[PDB]
Each structure stands twice: as C-alpha cells, then as structure tokens.
C-alpha cells in the first residue's frame, strides 16, 4: 500500500486561455478542477482550481512508463507494487486576461510551474507571455514548458514551434527549462511529464521552525442540507502554509480580520479561533505543513467564512506579531512594456495620486500613491494588508485601456 500523506509540493499550471491547463491537470490526477456554476456554464477556469495525486515509480519497468499515479505497475508489465515517491498538488490558474490578479494570487502559492502552450495556436500568445513574465517576477523558476495539443498538428509544425519556444527562452532565466510535448485530451506522453515533474520540480527545502503562516485563498460554510445537528461544523478556511506548521487545537488568528466599526472609523478586528480539524483533499490529519492546499476547520460562525469571505487573509498563531498596514512603502522596479496586451505598449512612470492594484501574498488591494521617488513609492490602501516578513514580493498593476495590467514589482519595506 501507499501511505496517506499530505501533498508536499504545489505545482502551478499557467498559460493562455483554452490552451489546455485544466485538461492537463485532469490527465495527471483524474480530477476536473472547475467546481463553480459559472465555470461550467462558460467552459473556463475562474477561481483557482486544485487537484492532488500520488506519484510513484515501478522499479522493474523502463522510464518514462515506470512513472505512475496509482499503486499499480500492470501498465508497464509488472505485478510489483510501485515505490511511493511523494504526493503532489496542482494550482490551476485562469488564463483569461481579465483574471490576471487571480493568477497572481495563485502564483504566491507555487513551488514550481508548468507553462502550457498550445501547439495549434500562434506563439507567443498574450497570456503565454504574461504568465511567463509573472513567474519570473514572483520567482517561480522551477518551470516546465508543456507543448499541448500535439494531437492536432503535424510533426513538422510541432518541431517548428518547439524551436520558437527555445528561442523565446534563450537569454532569459528560463533558457534551460525543458519542453515536453503532450496531448492532455488523449493522455499522450503524460508519463514523460511526470518524470519531468520529478526531475525539474523537486520538493523545496522547508523551515518548520519559522512562525507558522498560511495564505488564505478559500473559505467555506461546509454545512449541507439534510444533515443531523451532530455533524454540523464551524467555518472552514482554505489555503497554503508557506512556513512553519499548524496543529489541531492550536489557537490561531486571521489577519487583517473582520471589517468593523471602531470609534466612528472603519477598522479590522483580528479574528481569533482554534483549529478544530485539518484536511487535505478528502483526508484528515492532525497537523499541516507546507505543500498542498489545506482546509482548516475552526469554531467560527460559518457566516464569517461563507463564499470566500476571507480570501487574501493570512492565518498565524494567536500570539504572533504580524504587521497589518494601511499604508505601505514599496521599493519598486517597472517593466519596460505591458506584456499582457495584444500590442505591447511602453510603461509610463508611476505618478502621485494614481490608483494602483497591489498583489501581496494571496491578497489583492487597490490603493492611492501618496509619494513617488526613483525606486520608492508609498501607497495608502483601501484595506490593510498583513505583511508577515520583511521584503515580501509585491506585484504592481495599473488600469490601462480598461484592464488591470501588471506594470512592475517590488519589495514591501517594513
Ligand atoms: N485536441 C486537443 N484539445 C485539447 C487538448 N487539451 C485540451 N483541449 C481542449 O481545449 C479546450 C480548453 O481546455 P481547458 O483545459 O479548459 O483549457 P484551459 O487552459 O484550462 O482554459 P482556461 O482555464 O479557461 O484558461 C477544451 O475544448 C479541451 O477539450 C489536447 O491535448 N488536444
Ligand atoms: N478541516 C475540515 N475541512 C473540511 C471539513 N468538511 C469539509 N472540509 C473541506 O472544506 C472544503 C469544502 O468542502 P465542501 O463544501 O463540503 O465540498 P466537498 O469537498 O465537495 O464535499 C473541502 O475542501 C473539504 O475538504 C471539516 O470538517 N474539517
Ligand atoms: Mg474554455
Ligand atoms: Mg482552466
């Protein structure tokens, strides 16, 4: 048998709309990540998708067919049980250009990524470029490029595009990243991709002694109709543990917290609660570490957590000291051009009184620029952000031609 453990690594899946991201996650894990009504109606990813799988290797078989996602080697001709390697998970991002902020919030959770490029579309499409640039800015360097949809192009065309892709990465941080051709729809060459994931997206070193921090991307009321009172639950909060670990019965807090009134002004009250349960996928655990997206059960009234109310928050231990800032100072750099547009425009300098969008951890916040210097801006935010460490990365977006567009990045200075 294989052990039941939490996933130990998060692999982003990014790329242009309809290039095959969600189908690729299904080919690997068996799971369709889209769970929302609007996603099914429109045939598109809107919220961050998620799926897990075990990975193992059949020691008697040849590679890449030796790599498997279930405890059997019958496919490669062996009756032996495969050796368990690790459990992995996928953060399936939307490719729609209007959903870039959602992609950026998912990128904060990624240990590595697969950039999916459709073989039957011109390269590089706007969000192929834009997601590539985002990965570079955020530092998600452990990249595999997957050339998808090879089932509907000639070998000549696939090879031509392959050369284009290598030339695109030439002279960049990604010069040496592998390109793996597959068909996500017909599950062709998926074994090679799993081998690639093992070689190129290793589980990173973690630090379990650091103060526990979870970035929140989901929150739920898990109570369903037709159930007895004796199995009703308090609010559940979902996200990624980025450092340290959490345990059942631990006293925790959600930051910035709840928007309330205090002294005729808007304030955020930290939400204190206790961990009642920990789940990854369909499995319960007593503790949670980095890797995978965890569901933290609490004793909170489920009205506080319903419908992703706490998206963008962080969770820490109750006694942790974490800055919660309404005004932030950012040491910044600007991109040369707006990469996500069908036409690349030059990026104008930041000016005082501009309203910008700031991506910090899993949070997305608008704010007004109160001060501009050569490499430093100060921003008055519409809602405060939890800044759990010095020199946290922020991505800066500006509204250009009716769309939020990534224009730069920086470090939040505390
Ligand atoms: N022929 C062929 N079609 C594919 C392949 N992979 C995906 N598709 C099709 O491409 C369309 C888009 O697939 P999705 O998986 O929804 O693509 P996506 O990148 O997740 O789209 P968004 O999340 O909205 O950005 C669907 O019709 C798929 O069936 C493939 O390998 N070959
Ligand atoms: N920690 C914890 N997580 C839960 C509990 N019940 C549900 N979840 C998680 O909360 C998320 C929402 O689940 P739900 O609304 O029931 O949809 P479902 O996963 O399809 O059953 C899922 O990822 C569950 O794994 C619980 O009692 N404790
Ligand atoms: Mg679609
Ligand atoms: Mg999708």
Residue numbers in the entry: 2 to 415
Q: What does the literature reporting this entry say, word for word?
A:
In eukaryotic and archaeal cells, the initiator tRNA carrier is the e/aIF2 heterotrimer. In its GTP-bound form, this factor specifically binds Met-tRNAiMet and brings it to the initiation complex. The γ subunit forms the core of the heterotrimer and contains the GTP-binding pocket. α and β are bound to γ but do not interact together. We were able to observe GTP hydrolysis by aIF2 or by its isolated γ subunit.
H97A and D19A mutants were crystallized in the same conditions as those used for wt-aIF2γ but in the presence of GTP-Mg2+. In keeping with the observed decreased rates of GTP hydrolysis, we observed that GTP was intact within the crystals grown at 4°C. In the D19A-GTP4 and H97A-GTP4 structures, GTP is tightly bound to the canonical nucleotide-binding pocket in a position similar to that of GDPNP in wt-aIF2γ. Unexpectedly in H97A-GTP4 structure, a second magnesium ion (hereafter named Mg2) is observed within the nucleotide-binding pocket. The octahedral coordination of the second magnesium ion is clearly visible. Four water molecules form the equatorial plane. No alternate conformation of D19 is observed showing that the residue is now tightly stabilized. Accordingly, the high quality electron density maps suggested that in H97A-GTP4, a very small fraction of GTP was converted into GDP-Pi. Strikingly, the position of the catalytic arginine residue of RasGAP (R789) matches that of the second magnesium ion bound to D19.
